[PDB]
A paper describes a structure:
The tri-longin domain (TLD) RabGEF complexes represent a family of RabGEFs with a unique conserved structural core. In each complex, two subunits that contain three longin domains (LD1 to LD3) each form a heterodimer, which is required for catalytic activity toward the cognate Rab GTPases. We here report the cryo-EM structures of the Mon1-Ccz1 and Inturned-Fuzzy core complexes bound to their cognate GTPases Ypt7 and Rab23 in the nucleotide exchange transition states, revealing a conserved catalytic mechanism with distinct modes of substrate recognition. Thus, TLD RabGEFs rely on both conservation and variability in the switch 1 regions of their substrates to realize catalytic efficiency and specificity.
To resolve the HsFuzzy-Inturned-Rab23 complex, we again used a nucleotide-free mutant of the GTPase (Rab23N121I) and performed coexpression in insect cells. All longin domains of Fuzzy and Inturned are well resolved, but as in CPLANE, an N-terminal PDZ domain of Inturned is not visible in the map. Fuzzy and Mon1 fulfill homologous functions and contribute most of the interface with Rab23 (885 Å2) and Ypt7 (1270 Å2), respectively. However, Inturned and Ccz1 also both make critical contacts with the switch 1 regions (428 and 469 Å2, respectively). When bound to its GEF, K39 and Y38 of Rab23 adopt the same conformation as the corresponding residues of Ypt7. However, upon mutation of either of the conserved residues K39 to alanine or Y38 to arginine, Rab23 cannot be stimulated by Fuzzy-Inturned. The guanine base stabilizing aromatic residue F34 of Rab23 is removed from the binding pocket, but in contrast to F33 of Ypt7, it does not bind to a hydrophobic pocket on the GEF surface. Instead, residues I33 and T35 interact with Inturned and thus fix the switch 1 conformation. A double mutant Rab23I33A/T35A showed increased intrinsic nucleotide exchange but reduced stimulation of nucleotide exchange by Fuzzy-Inturned. However, the ~5-fold diminished ability of Fuzzy-Inturned to promote nucleotide exchange of Rab23I33A/T35A confirms the importance of these amino acids for recognition by the GEF and for the catalytic function.
Residue numbers in the entry:
A (entry chain B): 302 to 447, 456 to 495, 511 to 552, 556 to 569, 586 to 608, 622 to 648, 797 to 822, 827 to 857, ...
B (entry chain C): 5 to 122, 129 to 178
C (entry chain A): 8 to 251, 261 to 342, 362 to 418
Write the structure that this text describes.
Amino acid sequence: GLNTPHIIMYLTLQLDSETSKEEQEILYHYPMSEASQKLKSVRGIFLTLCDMLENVTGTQVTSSSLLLNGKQIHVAYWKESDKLLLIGLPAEEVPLPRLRNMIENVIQTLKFMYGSLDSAFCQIENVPRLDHFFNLFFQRALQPAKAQQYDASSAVLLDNLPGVRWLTLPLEIKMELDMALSDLEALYTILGSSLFYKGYLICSHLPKDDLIDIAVYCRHYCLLPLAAIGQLIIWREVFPQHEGRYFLLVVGLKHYMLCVLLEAGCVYVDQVKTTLHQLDGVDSRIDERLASNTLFHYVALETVQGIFITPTLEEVAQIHPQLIKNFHQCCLSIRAVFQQTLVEEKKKGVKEHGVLFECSMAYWVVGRLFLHPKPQELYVCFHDSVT
Amino acid sequence: DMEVAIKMVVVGNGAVGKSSMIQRYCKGIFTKDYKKTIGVDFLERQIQVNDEDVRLMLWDTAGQEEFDAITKAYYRGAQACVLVFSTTDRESFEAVSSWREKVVAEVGDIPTVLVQIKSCIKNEEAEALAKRLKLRFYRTSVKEDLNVNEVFKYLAEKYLQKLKQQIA
Amino acid sequence: GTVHLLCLAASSGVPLFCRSSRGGAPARQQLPFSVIGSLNGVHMFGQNLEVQLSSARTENTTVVWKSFHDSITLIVLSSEVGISELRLERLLQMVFGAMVLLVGLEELTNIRNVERLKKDLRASYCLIDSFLGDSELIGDLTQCVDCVIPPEGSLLQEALSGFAEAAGTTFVSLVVSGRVVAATEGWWRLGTPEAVLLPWLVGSLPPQTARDYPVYLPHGSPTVPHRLLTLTLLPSLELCLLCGPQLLERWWQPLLDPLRACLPLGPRALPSGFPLHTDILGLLLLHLELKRCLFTVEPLGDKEPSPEQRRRLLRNFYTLVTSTHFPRACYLVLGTEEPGTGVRLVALQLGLRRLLLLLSPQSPTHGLRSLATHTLHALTPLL
């Protein structure tokens, strides 16, 4: 809720000024209300903790937990040169691994917005839109319920995995979509593009290092609804972890979301609108595809390409409402167990995990990792009749 | 080792360069960048006083009013205190009385002493306050590198006298 | 595996000692006052602002604070690979329970002076750095007594009852290597921290024929100085007797042979040659209603060497099992993707008798729950 403590803030380390007011070390803090003043006070604890753990441990502070008013609040860190970004959310609403994933995603999004996040927070003209974005951030983290409630329930897990909800496609539909997107590629050059349908990614040529940024930016603004109009013509400069300008276009029409990245060194909108109009003949086919073993649910994920496959809303329509949310909630902890070995592998560059549930009807919620083949993760709920 | 572990609490104004003299005294552990966020800096310097390897837990306090109530938490249990002030600075000259009354009202009556480091003020007035509040003034400079370890040795000797007094 | 335990006086701020067991071995490492002062200061900053700073995790290590009562705090640094918060919190609770066991609530709350407090706690490190270093028991982490089932003989309990009646005490316990072999009902009904502290305390104590030490019961008698008499009649075997050479020969003389059977039974828990699946390389069981723990590491020692490794995997797995659990089960297969490599860890809760298992990778993944149910059915008649 709104009254529940939460904060996002951007302190400056190595304070070298004679003044010691709040604005001296706080570059930007949200929310500026009664839900964050206490953490605004404990900011000094946060700074001392970061500096101390820098001195004693060679690594950065991953996170911390603080018992406020009888409930534990998790705070996640990130230390840059002279700046420390820091977020804080309740544990009962946001578990710690989820909090770390949200912090890394939000920092990637901010770097996608305006260069390094130092230039994101240092400026003042971006304060109102930063407040708007963080209001969306907190309202999504705390009040996801805003086709009903199924996406919100699945969120608590789906945001954790990289990628988008990839929709399995026939050969002909994929081929014609690829041809249309290549025709769209044909002042600026096109790095690539990606088409999403009703919140489901339908076809991508963009490299994953920018596709992930596209996905997280679109999601942070609730641009991927389910069973959702106008002409979204988003046209803005972005900085996708890569000098020259790296502009971005996002065109929306009748459940079609085409995101195309442009390099540098209505002109580019008319042809994409015509492409969407001519592709409007495949919406019926893609809807037919969207419509229509003891395996109940699977969130099979790929890493190198960067996509995950989940059953469609129609598939989950046919104890199931409890099943999905319990499965996602437990897969969050299984995700934590797996990110332990994932960061171990990243250092190099464990095998699986299983669970019973009887909140009824066995469950065998099983997470599996594949590192010897192309890295990927699988998460399955199924009955215990056959294993 | 059986260290006595006497706790210094040092109170000044934050703009008198007390951090400089304390860093000059004890090397290694500094933790200098915490007075602006929490309000106290923690330092240590073991010193050989009268056959005793006395451990000195120095707790520098932030002179800014931003950290005052929290500062009151660090005074309690401190085995001795030190009031620093500068001959050049004026505010600390009258702030020493406030610091003394606060430090004695927080934890209690302690065998402490003050120190003037590194003019706008006269030595006679400093002696006046010193004789007024039972402690002796010390003439200290950032360049002489003296009249400070004697301060700490004297305070440690006072605490050692206290401990050997009530141990029996 | 660097680990530092710092005990601080919350009211004053002066640390009590810097006990640390870096690298498992009892290294006499002195943590510089920089970090001690800084952690104490952040703790008082939180306490003043009515916000309890519990823990802070970094990529390498993990630090944790907590405040017992009002005047005592304990903080830990720990760089061991595979650390979770709950292990550290149980360690904190157990060290505080040990403190109140050895010095009592008096001189721990309402401290007249902390110098004599540290001088008194000088007689208390040994159990603490036994805790912090590598240990053969997990009773600290699970808060359950590391009981070992006797060789299916009521003669042990009868002899213990006779000894208790002779000595006029209801708190008597036969313990081997810190593992509770037998005890009267009063010892079973003992409070949660000291029930596991006392056998551990004696295990950490130097081996002597007879010893008399004063303790305080964290449950029941936090202030009453109960005297504990420890008698080591046999190597690694000990008898504890609590009170608020003709001492054992009239009861324990005919039981010398079973006690001989208990000399190797300590490290090798469970009845000797118990019928168990040969793929199990380490067993760990809990009885939550009775708070009784059974932790054995050598059911099959030829494969997967370094039993301390098995102990650490079982402890970490228990931490994750408590994280998820708190007709349910969970398993974790670790190691390389190559078949025949790695280990399996299984856990099953049935009838408030949560049980853990460590297995060779050849064990059937599909039958892991079946094997756990079989082990639970084989172990339920034991206790």
